[PDB]
Design a protein around this ligand. Structure first.
Ligand SMILES: [Cl-]
Lengths: 388, 394
């Protein structure tokens, strides 16, 4: 059985922040799941005051592919609820800075949290013995240590870098960590010689493109300031120091900035030239090279053959650090077909069992292409796919 | 003789960043000054490409009270010029992170900089012998170490927390550090017994004044205050801090027009008051990292939370009306300096001899009153009389 970890701690000012994953696993569940979560996740569906949350938007339910759970759907699983008081305690140990508290939660072992997790799991020890793996939407060394004591692994699972409408929907699945401390590079290193791809980057990019590619400066990508990427996995770089970094190398009218609509702040009116392109691709094509901390837009540039500079930690960084025309295509082919997972599968318990048995990269790739579609060797599967 | 440290390194993307202090010292100088600075400081005045800078604006000139130097004014001093290329080197040592580089400069010793400082001072040993003190506009452990080694003291000088036209013009003068690592608290702890002020907090405020729910003050993102003296707090985490305690309905945000970024429209209630005071009176309590507005809030008797390091924080850490007043009185009259005086070589030589607090307060009140002497008044008596109400005669 699965144990899904969905912490209630409002680090970013939002209750039940990972509610969409709760709804998604509930909608896709076939067997009982152990949810390690908070009481807010259990009351929010019936909370008449949180009716305007984006998770309840019909467009979001359709985009992420779930429906709202009824009583039977929610009640037929197992629950362990994390104590509401631990958040305030964590805050007090970091000068009540919610951001710095979030960072510690993502990158450090927290004894109090491990203790509570142990106590919760011990209350249903018979249930825990049946657990096949732990699942987390974010890194959490506390949870990861606790899982090791039980001889269990933690699958880190998150929305992927390529998404609709532009691309096929993808997801992250990482045994080491998602976004930060990813295992993507280590995975490719072990199975590199199995990848001999007969294609260009355009061929790897168009297969995932679902829309007619746009027609044919220094690009700077801004991101949301208070997410895990810029709080913990940024190598101390920020939106400000990123702009400062590029400024050390370029003049103002040679710089095109791509703002993120979800950011708390935006650049003042007449400081930089702001891009107003219909999409990421239309922005990238106006640039000679692209600068980013760890935006997924950076992946898109690399896939289109644009010179990209990555200042933060991310899953696709190892691809860019390769000098070679064919060495890059092979690395990207692995990332796209073997590392990235079709979005729906990471919520499919049968697929998760498959990944849990530690299958060969060939089996993983074949399973993904099988999903994408409507040959035996790994390279032949990919080559045949991006030609048809 | 004075030595004034004006580094050329464009930590904030601005070359000759401390140009205004160069112009001010040149304007007020009576004797030869040793400027430890960069070539950019000497060429900017005659560089038409940079005439658009605020330092040349008539309003800014009259506000800070200086005029542009002619050939004689600039040439009659001693110069030691630092290599601009050290900035790029320092950058490379900090993962090309300009923020981390500036922070190191302000809070850490840098061996290469100490090497270059000593080598420059070695070129004019005879001149250095007659230097009494080093002056720095910012904290710099590299410079401070070099100076002490040569048996010189360091005065950290910067524009103050209270400024015209709202207030009397003030400046910082601190031997330990300016903004961060200040000696204001330690200094008061030593002389607090001499402060028995028989007046209100409002009297103190009104003396410096020349005009008359949850408040959050935003600051410039890349200045030294938010880079090094912030206790890891940012504009982002400051808003997070308050949101944890208050609903968005009860939050009022005072934006800083000098910032690189601005809040998106319909996220917070953005204040549009005419000034800081007008913003403060709309709040039950004010939250800040280390903005000068936080001082104004305390001076008006508003509850204030200070998350970062700054010179006035020790005032807030006291309980009691009498206690806060005696602390604020010290801060305003003894710690803060009349702006023009920190550029006056005689006053600086006066401070170098480390006089008693009464003498310092006496000097300051003399200036503020635009008088001249001395009297039998105690320190507190001077302050009490200076801020007390006196009726007109008839
Ligand atoms: Cl900030």
């Amino acid at each position: 059985g699965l144990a899904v970890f969905l912490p209630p701690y409002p680090f970013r000012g939002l209750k039940a922040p990972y509610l969409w994953m709760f709804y998604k696993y509930l909608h896709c569940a076939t067997d009982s799941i152990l949810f390690i979560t908070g009481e807010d996740y259990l009351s929010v569906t019936d909370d008449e005051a949180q009716r305007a949350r984006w998770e309840f938007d019909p467009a979001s339910m359709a985009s992420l592919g779930y429906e709202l759970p009824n009583a039977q759907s929610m009640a037929c699983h197992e629950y362990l609820t994390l104590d509401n008081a631990f958040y305030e305690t964590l805050l007090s140990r970091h000068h009540h800075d919610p951001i710095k508290s979030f960072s510690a939660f993502l990158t450090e072992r927290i004894p109090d949290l491990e203790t509570e997790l142990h106590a919760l799991l011990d209350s249903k020890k018979g249930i825990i013995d049946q657990i096949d793996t732990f699942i987390s939407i974010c890194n959490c060394p506390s949870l990861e240590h606790v899982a090791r004591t039980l001889g269990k692994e933690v699958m880190h699972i998150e929305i992927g870098p390529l998404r609709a409408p532009m691309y096929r929907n993808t997801a992250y699945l990482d045994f080491a960590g998602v976004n930060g401390g990813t295992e993507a590079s280590a995975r490719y290193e072990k199975c590199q010689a199995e990848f001999d791809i007969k294609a260009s980057l355009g061929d790897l990019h168009n297969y995932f493109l679902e829309v007619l590619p746009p027609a044919e400066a220094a690009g700077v990508v801004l991101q949301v300031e208070d997410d895990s990427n810029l709080i913990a996995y940024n190598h101390d770089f920020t939106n400000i120091s990123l702009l400062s970094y590029v400024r050390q190398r370029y003049e103002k009218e040679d710089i095109l900035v791509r703002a993120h609509p979800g950011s708390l702040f935006r650049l003042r009116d007449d400081v930089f030239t702001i891009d107003d392109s219909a999409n990421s691709l239309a922005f990238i094509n106006q640039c000679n090279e692209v600068f980013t901390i760890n935006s997924s837009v950076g992946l898109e540039a690399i896939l289109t053959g644009k010179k990209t500079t990555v200042l933060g930690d991310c899953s696709y960084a190892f691809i860019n650090e390769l000098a070679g025309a064919s060495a890059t295509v092979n690395a990207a082919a692995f990332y796209l077909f073997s590392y990235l997972v079709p979005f729906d599968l990471v919520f499919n318990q049968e697929y998760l069992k498959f990944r849990l048995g530690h299958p060969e990269e060939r089996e993983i790739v074949g399973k993904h292409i099988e999903f994408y579609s409507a040959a035996h060797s790994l390279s032949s599967l990919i080559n045949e796919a991006i030609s048809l």
